[PDB]
């Protein structure tokens, strides 16, 4: 996250870090043994790490669960980033409370405008590299299709949507993918993609949950 702030300890209690030796991804936790997170952060032997603020120090109310199964959406295109949303299965069910919470899943799409949560511990800075150790957040806008659609021509589907300011300066970033997008306590966005970090009008561009809502109900019904 560029340009953000740090969150505070265990404040965004369904944010999930990734785990295959080091953090490589965010995700979000949906239910007790489900995570939601980018088809792009696919890869084997993934350990979720839940209720982490500092991902380099225990602080006391992590739980480290390894998955059991990846369930990459069925029509995910990784040149295009289409359809870029993967669910994973937690191999025992996390222990919820106030620091390990699930977010809820939208019932109706997010309007440009809506005020959104971003967050992660993706790199901070939008011309180096420094990667936080702390949990970092972002409040940042919905952007109109049009706005989206023009500042990446022939790039955003239907199932894409902008975030975040064409000034630049405030963004998501390498390491925050897979991560979520909160607004009004439903989770309506995915870390996907963008063209660098919090560059003028290149917004980020974030998986749009809402179109994938039945896919996960029923995957999360039969698995
Ligand atoms: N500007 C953004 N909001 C932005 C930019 C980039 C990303 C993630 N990229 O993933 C890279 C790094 C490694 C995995 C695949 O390739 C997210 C958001
Ligand atoms: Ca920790």
Request: charged share 10%; with cysteine; aromatic share 8%.
């Amino acid at each position: 996250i560029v340009g953000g702030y740090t969150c505070g300890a265990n404040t965004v209690p369904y944010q999930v870090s990734l785990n295959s030796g080091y953090h490589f991804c965010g995700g979000s936790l949906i239910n007790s043994q489900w995570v939601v997170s980018a088809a792009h952060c696919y890869k084997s032997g993934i350990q979720v790490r839940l209720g982490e603020d500092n991902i380099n120090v225990v602080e006391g109310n992590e739980q480290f669960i390894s998955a059991s199964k990846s369930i990459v959406h069925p029509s995910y295109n990784s040149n295009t980033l289409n359809n870029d949303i993967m669910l994973i299965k937690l191999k025992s069910a996390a222990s919820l409370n106030s620091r390990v919470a699930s977010i809820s899943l939208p019932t109706s799409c997010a309007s440009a405008g809506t005020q959104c949560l971003i967050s992660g511990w993706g790199n901070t800075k939008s011309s180096g590299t420094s990667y936080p150790d702390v949990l970092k957040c972002l409040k940042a806008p919905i952007l109109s299709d049009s706005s989206c659609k023009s500042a990446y021509p022939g790039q955003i589907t239907s199932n894409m949507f902008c975030a975040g300011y064409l000034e630049g300066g405030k963004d998501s970033c390498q390491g925050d993918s897979g991560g979520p997008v909160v607004c009004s306590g439903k989770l309506q966005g995915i870390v996907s993609w963008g063209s660098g970090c919090a560059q003028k009008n290149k917004p980020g561009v974030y998986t749009k949950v809402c179109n994938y809502v039945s896919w996960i109900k029923q995957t999360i019904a039969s698995n």
